[PDB]
Coordinates of C-alpha atoms and ligand atoms in Angstrom, one line a residue:
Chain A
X212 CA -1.7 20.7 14.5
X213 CA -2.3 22.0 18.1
X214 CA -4.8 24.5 19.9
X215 CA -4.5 26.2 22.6
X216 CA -7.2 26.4 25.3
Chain B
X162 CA -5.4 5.7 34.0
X163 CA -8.7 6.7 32.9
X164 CA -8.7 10.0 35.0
X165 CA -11.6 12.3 35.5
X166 CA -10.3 16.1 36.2
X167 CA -12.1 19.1 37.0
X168 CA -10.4 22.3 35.6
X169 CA -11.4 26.0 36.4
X170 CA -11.3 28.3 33.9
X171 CA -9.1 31.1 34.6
X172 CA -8.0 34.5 33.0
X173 CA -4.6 33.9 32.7
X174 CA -4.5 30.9 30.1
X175 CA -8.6 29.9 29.9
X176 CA -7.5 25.9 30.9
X177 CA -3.6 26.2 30.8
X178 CA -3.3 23.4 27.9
X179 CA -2.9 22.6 24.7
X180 CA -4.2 19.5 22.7
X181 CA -3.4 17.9 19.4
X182 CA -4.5 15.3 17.1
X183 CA -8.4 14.4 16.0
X184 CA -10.3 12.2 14.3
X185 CA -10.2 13.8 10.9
X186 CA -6.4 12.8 11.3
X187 CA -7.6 9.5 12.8
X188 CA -6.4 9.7 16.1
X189 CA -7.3 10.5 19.2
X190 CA -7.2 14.2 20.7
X191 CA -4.0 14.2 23.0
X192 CA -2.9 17.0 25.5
X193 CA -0.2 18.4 23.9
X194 CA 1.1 21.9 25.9
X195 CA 0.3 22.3 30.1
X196 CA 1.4 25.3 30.9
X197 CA 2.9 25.6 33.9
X198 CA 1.2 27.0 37.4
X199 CA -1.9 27.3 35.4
X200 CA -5.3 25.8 35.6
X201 CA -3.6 22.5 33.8
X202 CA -1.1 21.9 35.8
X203 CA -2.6 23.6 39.3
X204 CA -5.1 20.3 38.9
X205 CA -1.9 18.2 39.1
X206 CA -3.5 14.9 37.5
X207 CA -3.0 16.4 33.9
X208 CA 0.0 15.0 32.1
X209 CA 1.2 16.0 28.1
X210 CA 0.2 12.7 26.7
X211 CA -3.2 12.2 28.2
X212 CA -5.7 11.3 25.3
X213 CA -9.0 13.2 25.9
X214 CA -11.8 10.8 25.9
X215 CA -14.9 13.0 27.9
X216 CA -15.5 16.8 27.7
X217 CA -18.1 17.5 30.9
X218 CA -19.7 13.6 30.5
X219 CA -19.5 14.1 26.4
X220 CA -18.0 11.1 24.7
X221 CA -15.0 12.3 22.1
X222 CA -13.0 9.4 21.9
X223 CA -13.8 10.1 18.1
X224 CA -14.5 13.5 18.0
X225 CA -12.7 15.7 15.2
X226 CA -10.3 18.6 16.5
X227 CA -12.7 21.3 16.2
X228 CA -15.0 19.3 18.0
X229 CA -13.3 19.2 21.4
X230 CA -12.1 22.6 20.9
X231 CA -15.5 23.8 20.9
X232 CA -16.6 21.8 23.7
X233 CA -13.8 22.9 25.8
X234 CA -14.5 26.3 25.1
X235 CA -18.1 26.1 25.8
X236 CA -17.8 24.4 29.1
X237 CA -18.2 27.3 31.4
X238 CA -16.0 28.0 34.3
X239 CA -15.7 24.7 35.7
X240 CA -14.8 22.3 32.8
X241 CA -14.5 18.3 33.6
X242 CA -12.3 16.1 31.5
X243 CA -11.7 12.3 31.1
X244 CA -8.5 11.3 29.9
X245 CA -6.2 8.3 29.4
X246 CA -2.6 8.4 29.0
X247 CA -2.1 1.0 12.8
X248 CA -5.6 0.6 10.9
X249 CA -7.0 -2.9 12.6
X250 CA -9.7 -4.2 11.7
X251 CA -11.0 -3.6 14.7
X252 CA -10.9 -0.4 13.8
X253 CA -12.7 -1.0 10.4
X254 CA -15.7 -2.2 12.5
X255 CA -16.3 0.7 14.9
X256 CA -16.2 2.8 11.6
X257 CA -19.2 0.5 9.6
X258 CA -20.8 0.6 13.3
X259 CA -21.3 4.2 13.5
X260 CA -21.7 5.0 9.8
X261 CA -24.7 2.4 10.5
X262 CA -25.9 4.5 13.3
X263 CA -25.8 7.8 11.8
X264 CA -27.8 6.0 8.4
X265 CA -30.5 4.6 10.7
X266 CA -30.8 8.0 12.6
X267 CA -33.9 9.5 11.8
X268 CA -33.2 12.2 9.0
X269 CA -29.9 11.1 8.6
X270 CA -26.5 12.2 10.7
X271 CA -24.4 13.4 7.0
X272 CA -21.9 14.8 9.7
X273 CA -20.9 11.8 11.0
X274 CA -20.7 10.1 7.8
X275 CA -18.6 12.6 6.2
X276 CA -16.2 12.9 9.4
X277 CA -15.0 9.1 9.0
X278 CA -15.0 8.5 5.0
X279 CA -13.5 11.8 3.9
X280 CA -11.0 11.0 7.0
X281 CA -10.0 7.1 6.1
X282 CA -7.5 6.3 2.9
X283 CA -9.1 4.4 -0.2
X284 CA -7.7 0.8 1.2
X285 CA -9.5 1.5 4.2
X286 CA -12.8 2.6 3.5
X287 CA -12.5 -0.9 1.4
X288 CA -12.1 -2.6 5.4
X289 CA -15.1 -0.2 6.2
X290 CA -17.3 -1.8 3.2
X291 CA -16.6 -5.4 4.3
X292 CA -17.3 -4.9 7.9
X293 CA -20.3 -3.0 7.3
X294 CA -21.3 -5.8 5.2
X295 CA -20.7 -8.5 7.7
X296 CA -23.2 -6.4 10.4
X297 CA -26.2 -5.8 8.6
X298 CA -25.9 -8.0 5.5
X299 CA -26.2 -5.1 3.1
X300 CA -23.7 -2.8 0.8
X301 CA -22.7 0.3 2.1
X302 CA -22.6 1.7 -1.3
X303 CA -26.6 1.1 -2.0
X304 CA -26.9 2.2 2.1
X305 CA -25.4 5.7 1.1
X306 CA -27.3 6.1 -2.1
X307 CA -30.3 6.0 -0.8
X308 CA -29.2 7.7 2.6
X309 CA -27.8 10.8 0.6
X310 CA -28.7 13.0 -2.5
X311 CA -27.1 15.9 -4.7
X312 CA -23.2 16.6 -4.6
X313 CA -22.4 14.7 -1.0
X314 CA -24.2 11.7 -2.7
X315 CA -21.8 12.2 -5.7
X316 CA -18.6 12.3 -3.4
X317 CA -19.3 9.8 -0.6
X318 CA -20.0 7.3 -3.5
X319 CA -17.5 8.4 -5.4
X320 CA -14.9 8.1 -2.5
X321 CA -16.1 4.4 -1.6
X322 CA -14.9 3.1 -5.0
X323 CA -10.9 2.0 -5.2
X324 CA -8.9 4.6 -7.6
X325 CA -9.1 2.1 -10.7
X326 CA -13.5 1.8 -10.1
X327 CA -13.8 5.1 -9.7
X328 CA -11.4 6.0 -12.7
X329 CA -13.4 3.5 -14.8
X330 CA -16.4 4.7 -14.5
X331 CA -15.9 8.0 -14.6
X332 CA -14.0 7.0 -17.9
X333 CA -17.2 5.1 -18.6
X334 CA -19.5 8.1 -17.7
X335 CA -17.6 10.5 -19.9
X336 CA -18.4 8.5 -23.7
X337 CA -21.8 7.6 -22.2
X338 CA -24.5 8.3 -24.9
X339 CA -23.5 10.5 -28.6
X340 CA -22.1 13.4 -26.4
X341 CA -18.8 12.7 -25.2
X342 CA -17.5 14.9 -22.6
X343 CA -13.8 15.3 -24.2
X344 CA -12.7 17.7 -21.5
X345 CA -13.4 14.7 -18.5
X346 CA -12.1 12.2 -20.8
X347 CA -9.0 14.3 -21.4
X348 CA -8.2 15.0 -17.7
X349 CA -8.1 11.0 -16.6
X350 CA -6.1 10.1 -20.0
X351 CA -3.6 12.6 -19.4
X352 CA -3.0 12.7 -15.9
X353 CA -2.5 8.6 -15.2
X354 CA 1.0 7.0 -14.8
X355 CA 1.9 3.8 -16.0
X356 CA 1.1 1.8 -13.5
X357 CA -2.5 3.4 -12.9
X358 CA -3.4 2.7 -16.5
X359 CA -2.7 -0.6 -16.4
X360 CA -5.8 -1.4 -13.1
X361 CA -7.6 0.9 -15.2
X362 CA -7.6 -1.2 -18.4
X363 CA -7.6 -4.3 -15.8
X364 CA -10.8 -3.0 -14.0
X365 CA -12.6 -1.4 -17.3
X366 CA -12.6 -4.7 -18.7
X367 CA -14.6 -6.4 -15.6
X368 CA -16.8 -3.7 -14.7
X369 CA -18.1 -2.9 -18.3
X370 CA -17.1 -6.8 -20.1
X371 CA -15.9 -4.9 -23.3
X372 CA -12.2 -3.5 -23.4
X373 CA -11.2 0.6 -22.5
X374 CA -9.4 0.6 -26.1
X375 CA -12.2 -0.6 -27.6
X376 CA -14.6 2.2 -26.3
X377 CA -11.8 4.6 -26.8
X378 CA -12.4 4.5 -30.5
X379 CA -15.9 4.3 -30.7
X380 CA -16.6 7.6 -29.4
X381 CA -13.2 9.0 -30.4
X382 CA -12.2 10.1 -34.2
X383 CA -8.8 11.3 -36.5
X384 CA -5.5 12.3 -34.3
X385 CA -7.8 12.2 -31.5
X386 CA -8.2 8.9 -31.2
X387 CA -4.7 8.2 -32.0
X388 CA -3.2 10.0 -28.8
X389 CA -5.9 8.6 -26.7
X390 CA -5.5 5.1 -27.8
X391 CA -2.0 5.8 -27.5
X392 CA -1.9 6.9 -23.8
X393 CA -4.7 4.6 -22.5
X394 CA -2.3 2.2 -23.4
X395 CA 0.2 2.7 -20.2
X396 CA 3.6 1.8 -22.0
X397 CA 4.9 5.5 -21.4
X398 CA 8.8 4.6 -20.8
X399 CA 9.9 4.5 -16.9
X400 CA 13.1 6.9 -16.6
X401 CA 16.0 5.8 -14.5
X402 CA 19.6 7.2 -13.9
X403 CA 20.4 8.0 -17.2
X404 CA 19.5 11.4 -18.6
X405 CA 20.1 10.6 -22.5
X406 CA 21.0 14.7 -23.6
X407 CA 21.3 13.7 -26.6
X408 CA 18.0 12.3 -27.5
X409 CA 16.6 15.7 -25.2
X410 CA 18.4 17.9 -28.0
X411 CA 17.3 15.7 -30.8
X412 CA 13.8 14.9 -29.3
X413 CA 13.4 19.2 -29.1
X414 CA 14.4 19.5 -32.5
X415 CA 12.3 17.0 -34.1
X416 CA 9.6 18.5 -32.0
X417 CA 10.2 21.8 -33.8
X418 CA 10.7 20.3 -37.4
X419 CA 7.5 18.5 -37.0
X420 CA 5.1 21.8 -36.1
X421 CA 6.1 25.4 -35.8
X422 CA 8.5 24.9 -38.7
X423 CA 6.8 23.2 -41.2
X424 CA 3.6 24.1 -42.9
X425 CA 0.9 21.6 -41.1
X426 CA 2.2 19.2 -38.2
X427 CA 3.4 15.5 -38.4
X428 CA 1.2 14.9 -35.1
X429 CA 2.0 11.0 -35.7
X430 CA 5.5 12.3 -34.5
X431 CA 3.8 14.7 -31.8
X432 CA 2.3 11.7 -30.5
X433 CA 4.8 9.4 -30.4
X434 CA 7.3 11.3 -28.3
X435 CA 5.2 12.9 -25.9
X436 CA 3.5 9.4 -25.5
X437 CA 6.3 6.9 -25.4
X438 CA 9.5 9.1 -23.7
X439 CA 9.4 9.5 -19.8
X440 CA 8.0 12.3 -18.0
X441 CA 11.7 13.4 -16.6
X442 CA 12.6 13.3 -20.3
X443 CA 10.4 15.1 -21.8
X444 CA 10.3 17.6 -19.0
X445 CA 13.9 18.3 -20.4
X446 CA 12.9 18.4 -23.7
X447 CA 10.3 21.1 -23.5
X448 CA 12.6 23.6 -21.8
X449 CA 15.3 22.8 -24.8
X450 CA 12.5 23.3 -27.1
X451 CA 12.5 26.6 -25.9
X452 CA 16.1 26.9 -27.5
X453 CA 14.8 26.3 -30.7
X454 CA 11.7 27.9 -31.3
X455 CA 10.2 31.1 -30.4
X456 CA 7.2 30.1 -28.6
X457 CA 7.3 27.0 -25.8
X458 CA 5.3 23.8 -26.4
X459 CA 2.1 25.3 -25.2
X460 CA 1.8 27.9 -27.6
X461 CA 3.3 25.8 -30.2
X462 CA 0.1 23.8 -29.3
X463 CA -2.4 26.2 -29.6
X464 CA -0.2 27.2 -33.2
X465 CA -0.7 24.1 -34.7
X466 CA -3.7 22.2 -33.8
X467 CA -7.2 23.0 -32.8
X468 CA -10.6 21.5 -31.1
X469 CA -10.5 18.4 -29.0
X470 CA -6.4 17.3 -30.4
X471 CA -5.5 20.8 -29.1
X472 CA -7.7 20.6 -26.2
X473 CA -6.0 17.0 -25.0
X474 CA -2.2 17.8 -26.2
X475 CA -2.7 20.8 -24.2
X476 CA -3.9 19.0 -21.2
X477 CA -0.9 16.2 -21.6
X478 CA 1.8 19.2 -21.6
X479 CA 0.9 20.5 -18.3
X480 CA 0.7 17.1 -16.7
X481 CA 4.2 16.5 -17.9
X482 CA 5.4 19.6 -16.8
X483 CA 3.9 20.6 -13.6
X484 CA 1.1 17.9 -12.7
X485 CA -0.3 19.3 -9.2
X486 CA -0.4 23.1 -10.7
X487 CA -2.2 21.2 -13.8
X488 CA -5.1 20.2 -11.3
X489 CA -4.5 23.4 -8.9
X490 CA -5.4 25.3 -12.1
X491 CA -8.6 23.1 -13.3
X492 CA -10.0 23.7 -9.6
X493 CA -9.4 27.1 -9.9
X494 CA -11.6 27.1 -13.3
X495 CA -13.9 24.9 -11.5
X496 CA -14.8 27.7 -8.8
X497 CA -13.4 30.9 -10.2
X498 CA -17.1 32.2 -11.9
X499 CA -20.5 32.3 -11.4
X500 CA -21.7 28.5 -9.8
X501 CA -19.4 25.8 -9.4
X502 CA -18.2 22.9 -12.3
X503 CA -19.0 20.8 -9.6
X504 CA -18.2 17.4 -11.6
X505 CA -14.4 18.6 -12.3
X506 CA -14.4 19.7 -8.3
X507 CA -15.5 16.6 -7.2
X508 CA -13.1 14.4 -9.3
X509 CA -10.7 15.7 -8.6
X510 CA -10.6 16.4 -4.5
X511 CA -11.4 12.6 -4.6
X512 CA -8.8 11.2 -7.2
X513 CA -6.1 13.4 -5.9
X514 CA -6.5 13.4 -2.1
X515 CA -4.5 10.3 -1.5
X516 CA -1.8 11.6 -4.4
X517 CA -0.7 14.7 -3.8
X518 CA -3.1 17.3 -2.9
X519 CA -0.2 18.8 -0.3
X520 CA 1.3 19.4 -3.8
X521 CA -1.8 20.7 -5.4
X522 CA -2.3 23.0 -2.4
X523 CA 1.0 24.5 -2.4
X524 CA 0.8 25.3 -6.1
X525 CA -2.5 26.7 -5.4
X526 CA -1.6 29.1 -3.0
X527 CA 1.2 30.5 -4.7
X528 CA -0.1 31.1 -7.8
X529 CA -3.9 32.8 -6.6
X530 CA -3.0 34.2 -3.1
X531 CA -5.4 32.3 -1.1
X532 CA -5.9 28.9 -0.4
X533 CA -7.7 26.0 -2.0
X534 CA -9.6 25.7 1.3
X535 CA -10.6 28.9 1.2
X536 CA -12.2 28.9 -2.3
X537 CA -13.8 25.6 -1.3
X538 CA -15.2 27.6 1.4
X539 CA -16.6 30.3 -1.1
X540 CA -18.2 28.1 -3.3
X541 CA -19.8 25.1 -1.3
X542 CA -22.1 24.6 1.6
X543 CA -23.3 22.3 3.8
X544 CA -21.6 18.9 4.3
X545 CA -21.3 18.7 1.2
X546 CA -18.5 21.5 1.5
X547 CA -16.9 19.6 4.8
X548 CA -16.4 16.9 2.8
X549 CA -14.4 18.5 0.3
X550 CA -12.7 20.7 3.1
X551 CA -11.6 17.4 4.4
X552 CA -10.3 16.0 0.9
X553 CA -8.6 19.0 0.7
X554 CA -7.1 18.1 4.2
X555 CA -6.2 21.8 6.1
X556 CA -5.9 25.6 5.2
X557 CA -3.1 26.9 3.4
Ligands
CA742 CA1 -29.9 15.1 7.7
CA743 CA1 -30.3 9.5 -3.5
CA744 CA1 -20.1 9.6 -28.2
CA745 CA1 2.8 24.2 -39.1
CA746 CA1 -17.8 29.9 -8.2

């Protein structure tokens, strides 16, 4: 469950 | 380490990191990826790890995922974060403490409500109730109920109850008045082990002072009545090591001597197998049914019987057989036409979420090619369809 910014 | 960092955004990688976590998982959003020589790691004072507490002076030491991925992408070209490198009770308390804020905000915060209930397991939204109790003296339960109205009303309470209340009722809701609603009465019966009979019966008889059998067969009639009575009852045999072949061969055959074989059915033997033998027996049972007789228990089903005995032995087949594609497939009824059966919806994103709606979902997106999220998403709105979305727990 990551995101990337 | 309560670090305050200034990033510049930059074409090559926006802010050079990734983060994880969130407080719809109940934890706090950590740094997961810095890529290297980019705006992440060219500050030098951001480490994988670091939990992000401030986005540009914004507090989101309890904000949800999307939350701080919006903020950080909304920051402009100078961005300014604060980082910091078991449910307690502690934890119980901040939860009734903001809840309390966001029902004493003028007009009424739903969003913050929804983010923490729909993100906490049963046993702790119980720890939430007591310490909201303990802060301002009054039930949470009659808080929301006046705070909230329509379908989030219907959820929020619905999710504050523990899984035997909230069975209960609903039990207690569904032979309510001359018109019982078989098909809600049905699903529960069916779909309950052992063990989650047993609190039912135990919690029926406090909440309503008058026993579950004994308001089974006042509003129930004929073989009905019988297979309800019969499952209600919770003394399905528990399987263990031994797979008896024999009795699967013999319990398939007197399955087929008892309907599709003979004219009429000997339901009393219906019920008493698929009541009293295990659920890993008589999983084995129905697919050496199939070796005797033309059409699979199902059909044989819809052979034999009709109205509500069909309806329920219908119901009880699927449950043995595939139980999260038997409640992947009533959701699907629930939203597949025009307006939403929003009672079944509701019952079961709140009964199952704690089960196993990862089970539900994957049987779901197999068998109708998008995901349970995404029909959610069709047929709800407003928080009322973020509260289900977080029942349902992710896409896919
Ligand atoms: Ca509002
Ligand atoms: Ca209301
Ligand atoms: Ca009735
Ligand atoms: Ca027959
Ligand atoms: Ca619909």
């Amino acid at each position: 469950p990551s995101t990337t910014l | 380490n309560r670090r305050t960092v200034t990033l510049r955004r930059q074409p090559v990688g926006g802010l050079g990191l990734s983060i994880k976590g969130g407080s719809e998982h109940n934890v706090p959003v950590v740094i997961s990826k810095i890529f290297e020589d980019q705006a992440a790691d060219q500050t030098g004072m951001l480490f994988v790890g670091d939990a992000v507490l401030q986005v540009n002076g914004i507090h989101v030491e309890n904000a949800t995922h999307e939350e701080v991925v919006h903020l950080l992408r909304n920051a402009g070209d100078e961005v300014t974060i604060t980082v910091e490198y078991a449910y307690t009770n502690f934890d119980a308390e901040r939860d009734a403490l903001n809840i309390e804020t966001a029902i004493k905000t003028k007009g009424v915060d739903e969003v913050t409500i929804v983010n923490i209930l729909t993100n906490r397991s049963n046993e702790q939204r119980q720890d939430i109730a007591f310490a909201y109790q303990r802060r301002t003296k009054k039930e949470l339960a009659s808080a929301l109920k006046s705070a909230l109205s329509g379908h989030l009303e219907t959820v929020i309470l619905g999710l504050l109850k523990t899984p035997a209340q909230y069975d209960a009722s609903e039990l207690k809701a569904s032979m309510k008045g001359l018109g019982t609603d078989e098909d809600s009465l049905i699903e529960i019966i069916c779909s309950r082990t052992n063990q989650e009979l047993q609190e039912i019966n135990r919690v029926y008889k406090e909440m309503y002072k008058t026993d579950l059998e004994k308001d089974i067969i006042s509003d129930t009639s004929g073989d009905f009545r019988k297979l309800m009575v019969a499952l209600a009852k919770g003394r399905r045999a528990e399987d263990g090591s031994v797979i008896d072949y024999e009795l699967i061969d013999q319990d398939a055959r007197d399955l087929y001597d008892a309907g599709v074989k003979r004219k009429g059915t000997d339901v009393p033997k219906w019920i008493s197998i698929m009541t009293e033998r295990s659920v890993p027996h008589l999983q084995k049972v129905f697919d050496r049914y199939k070796s005797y007789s033309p059409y699979d228990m199902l059909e044989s089903i819809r052979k034999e019987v009709k109205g509500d005995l069909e309806n329920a032995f219908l119901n009880l087949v699927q449950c043995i057989q595939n139980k999260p594609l038997y409640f992947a497939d009533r959701l699907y009824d629930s939203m597949k036409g025009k307006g939403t059966r929003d009672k079944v919806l509701i019952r079961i994103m709140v009964s199952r979420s704690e089960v196993d709606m990862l089970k539900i979902r994957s049987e779901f997106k197999r068998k109708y090619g998008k995901s349970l999220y995404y029909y959610i998403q069709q047929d709800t709105k407003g928080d009322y369809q973020k509260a289900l979305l977080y029942l349902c727990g992710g896409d896919d």
